[PDB]
Design an enzyme around this catalytic site. Structure first.
Site, PDB file in Angstrom:
ATOM      1  N   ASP A  35       0.906  -1.159   0.093  1.00  0.00           N
ATOM      2  CA  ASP A  35       0.048  -0.064  -0.120  1.00  0.00           C
ATOM      3  C   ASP A  35       0.925   1.138   0.033  1.00  0.00           C
ATOM      4  O   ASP A  35       1.291   1.614   1.144  1.00  0.00           O
ATOM      5  CB  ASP A  35      -1.063  -0.018   1.198  1.00  0.00           C
ATOM      6  CG  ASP A  35      -1.811   1.159   1.381  1.00  0.00           C
ATOM      7  OD1 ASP A  35      -1.876   1.760   0.151  1.00  0.00           O
ATOM      8  OD2 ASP A  35      -2.399   1.511   2.619  1.00  0.00           O
ATOM      9  N   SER A 199      -0.420  15.467 -11.963  1.00  0.00           N
ATOM     10  CA  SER A 199      -0.615  15.186 -13.391  1.00  0.00           C
ATOM     11  C   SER A 199      -0.854  16.487 -14.440  1.00  0.00           C
ATOM     12  O   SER A 199      -1.648  17.438 -13.929  1.00  0.00           O
ATOM     13  CB  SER A 199      -1.963  14.404 -13.566  1.00  0.00           C
ATOM     14  OG  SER A 199      -2.424  14.063 -14.691  1.00  0.00           O
TER      15      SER A 199
END
EC number: 3.4.23.22
Length: 330
Positions: A35, A199
């Protein structure tokens, strides 16, 4: 040193991925959910409330000659979906794919929430975010990667998740045969303890690319792709019959649909998520309403590039002094 381990979807939808991890002496192998969105290595154990264990493999510290109670230490964590776990701490030898850390904090669960009990395939989590998020008190503990880092050939790990198929976590090296083209690297902020990056935009299907900054985290422990409501609405508007259902808890779409791809920007590069990756199947057995793999992040408080996004790429988690993230197509 280096390590290399295969990671395997837990089910036909890729709801999560499990990777075998050796704990203790002699080894006890548990299948953990790696994770990159948390920083605790915790396991089902001999100490876990019996009623809360349902098919998992447990760690039994008393059978490990290298286990030592970390006296006074406790932990307690809550995840973004509301699940939780807590307990006490041992140190022990932990190996992943041939890479060994001695004195790793292994957090033994005394309590786990129902969602963990119900996932018979997940024996615990291995956190790979920054150690600043580790919940052990009163002495915070380091992640497996943080402990291994100085011994690694290169201070990196890579995530190569498969679509409906096994993949690979590598530590300490970049497998240049595992991706196509080049890896594009992008800046990371560690201020919130995550692999947080921005992004450069998105496209829906064959649509034109929208240049827009989307701050979010690279999180192998989140199933879906959570993005701003504007982006998500633009995606689902291209699927006939798709709608946001408050009763179901997100966007659903007719199972008869053919989903468009979704592209996200990494600098000047582009990662394409095939439409099929965005199908999470019937909302309930036999239903013709299917659950979408792109969902709004509104009310999460952060955008999350989860498995839906990451499995479309070869992803480098670069833990150099100034961390960065790399993405390549594959």
């Amino acid at each position: 040193s280096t390590g290399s381990a295969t990671t395997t979807p837990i089910d036909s939808l890729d709801d999560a991925y499990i990777t075998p991890v050796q704990i203790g002496t002699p080894a006890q192998t548990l299948n953990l959910d790696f994770d990159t969105g948390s920083s605790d290595l915790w396991v089902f154990s001999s100490e876990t409330t019996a009623s809360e264990v349902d098919g998992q493999t447990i760690y039994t510290p008393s059978k490990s000659t290298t286990a030592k109670l970390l006296s006074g230490a406790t932990w307690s964590i809550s995840y973004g979906d509301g699940s939780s776990s807590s307990g006490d701490v041992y140190t022990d030898t932990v190996s992943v794919g041939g890479l060994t850390v001695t004195g790793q904090a292994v957090e033994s669960a005394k309590k786990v929430s129902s969602s963990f009990t119900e996932d018979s395939t997940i024996d615990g989590l291995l956190g790979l975010a920054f150690s600043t998020l580790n919940t052990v008190s009163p002495t915070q503990q380091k992640t497996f990667f943080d402990n291994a880092k100085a011994s690694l050939d290169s201070p990196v790990f890579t995530a190569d998740l498969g679509y409906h198929a096994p993949g690979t976590y590598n530590f300490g090296f970049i497998d240049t045969t595992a991706y196509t083209g080049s890896i594009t690297y992008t800046a990371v902020s560690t201020k919130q303890g995550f692999w947080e990056w921005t992004s450069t935009g998105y496209a829906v299907g064959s649509g034109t690319f929208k240049s827009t900054s989307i701050d979010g985290i690279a999180d192998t422990g989140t199933t879906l792709l959570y993005l701003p409501a504007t982006v998500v609405s633009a995606y689902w508007a291209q699927v006939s019959g798709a709608k946001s259902s408050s009763s179901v808890g997100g966007y659903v779409f007719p199972c008869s649909a053919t989903l468009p791809s979704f592209t996200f920007g990494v600098g000047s590069a582009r990662i394409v998520i095939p439409g099929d990756y965005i199908d999470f199947g019937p909302i309930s057995t036999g239903s013709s309403s299917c659950f979408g793999g792109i969902q709004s992040s509104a009310g999460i408080g952060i955008n999350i590039f989860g498995d839906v996004a990451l499995k479309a790429a070869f992803v480098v988690f670069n833990g150099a002094t100034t961390p960065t993230l790399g993405f390549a197509s594959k």
